[model samples]
Target: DIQMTQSPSSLSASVGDRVTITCRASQDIIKYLAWYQQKPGKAPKLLIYEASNLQAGVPSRFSGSGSGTDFTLTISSLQPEDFATYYCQQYQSLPYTFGQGTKLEIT
Candidate 1:
């Protein structure tokens, strides 16, 4: 089982500022990493899958990259609707694991 540690745990940014979140895995996760964004009191929405594949209907401002034990989620330009808690999940092995969320807030 791979453990995922996501940082910085929380962030403060402006509407047009770029935001980046990272996930580190205890072991190689190959390209089996996925990213999700969750608004408070709502279900998470799949953002990226297989490391870098952006989900359909997701904004172009959101992207993901990396492999093995490292992964990243980047938002090119923050938007009012983009403020949320983000998480990373590993799908390489059974009993999937999720990273501790990174919360984004307006500066």
Candidate 2:
């Protein structure tokens, strides 16, 4: 399994705030990286894939960049409902792994 790590387990931001989180892979994942957002009781929604492709239905404000072993998820202007957990996953290999996750808090 490829290990994944995210910095700053939690963060404080206000409504309409712009936020960013970083993710690192134990090894190169090429463009096989994907990002997700999860809130409370709802299931996670895929935001970015293949390093930078935005999934269908995702807001234009949500974007991702980077490849190989590093990646970042950015919410250009976070909405009130956007407060949640963000995770990164690599589907390039078996025993897929995800980042520790970042909790977005309204404060």
Candidate 3:
């Protein structure tokens, strides 16, 4: 399993603010990185995949970047509904793993 570590276990931001969360893979993951958002009981939503590719129906304000062992997820002009938990995942090896997750909140 490829371990994933994300920075800033918690983040605070007001509406319209911008924020970036980063993650690192224990080993090379190439472009196998992905980003997901979960709001309470709802199933997690995929925001970006393959490092920087935005998923269909996802807002343009949300984006992902980086390659190999490091990656990041950014949101511009945050929305109130955007406050949630974000997890970074890597599928480069067997048993894909997700980061501990960063909780986003209103500041």
Q: Which stretches of candidate 3 lie over 4 Å from their true place?
A: none
lDDT measured at residue 85 in model 1 versus the true structure, 0 to 100: 98
Positional deviation of residue 79's Cα in model 1 after best superposition, in angstroms: 0.4
Native-structure RMSD, model 3:
0.7
Rank by lDDT (best first): 1, 3, 2
TM-score of 1: 0.98
- Reference-based lDDT, residue 1, model 1: 72
Give TM-scores for every candidate, taking all chains together and pairing residue i with residue i: 0.98, 0.95, 0.97
Candidate 3 C-alpha lDDT tens digits along 1-107: 68899988998999999999999999999999999999998888999999999999999999999998989999988999999999999988889999999999999
Whole-model lDDT per candidate: 0.95, 0.91, 0.94
Candidate 2, 19-38: lDDT as tens digits? 98999999999989999999
Best by lDDT: 1
Residues 16-72, model 1: lDDT tens digits? 999999999999989999999999999999999999999999999999999889999
